[model samples]
Target: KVFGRCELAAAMKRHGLDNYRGYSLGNWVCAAKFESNFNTQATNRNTDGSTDYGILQINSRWWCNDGRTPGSRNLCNIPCSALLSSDITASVNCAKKIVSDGNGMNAWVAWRNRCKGTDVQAWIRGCRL
Candidate 1:
């Protein structure tokens, strides 16, 4: 589930980071590192043993209910998975949509807020990407 630097960069590029306000590839990769340690295939088991998957830690049940049955041909039903499969860009786009009617970087700010005091921002600033 560990993502190398190249993979993380690829993910950021796919998501339009260059065009995003206040966004830089380095910061984006740092965010991913802080969020899930750069593990694209990472999963976590809840106390109840339910699974959450991917770099963004999307819940398998929630994603499956949205119709992304990874091996099925009806993949488009879960649009998020499409983005998820490609890179972090898709995930960021999806999260942005969940924010202010798809305007601005508020969603990213929200994510950062969740990571406050973790020095994730510091890592982002120090990254070379």
Candidate 2:
């Protein structure tokens, strides 16, 4: 499923992402935009042979168990396929775990390059949530 920006914001808020770990709702919203364009089924392969999965673009190398990524930690303890579902709960939960790690939002390059320290409020502006 592909979500509109406001809809994604509301969903993230429902999942406790608003102001989560000192990161504003806008940060998550903006990160999602650049990471997967709000598409639940988005996937991208890395040069390192790992794959990024789902809306948050969780990586197989450290987050999900793809059964193929070399030295994968499977820290999320979930199958990579699960992240591709329209229900984003697992993806959101796994993303929280990613953020809870030492990397924080820096786990995602898109967040660092596109959302961090920027005026991301516009990503969720006027959303009545």
Per model, how many backbone clashes are there? 2, 0
How many clashes in candidate 2? 0
TM-score, model 1 to reference:
0.50
TM-score of each candidate structure, all chains considered together: 0.50, 0.97
* Candidate 1 deviant stretches above 4 angstroms: 5-10, 18-27, 47-51, 60-89, 99-114, 117-121, 125-128
Q: What is the C-alpha lDDT of each candidate?
A: 0.51, 0.93
Best by TM-score: 2
Alpha carbon deviation, residue 118, candidate 1 (Å): 6.4
Model 2 segments beyond 4 Å from truth? Answer: none
Best by lDDT: 2
Can you write out model 2's per-residue Cα lDDT over 65-116, one digit (the tens) per residue? 9989989999999999999998889999999888998879998899999888
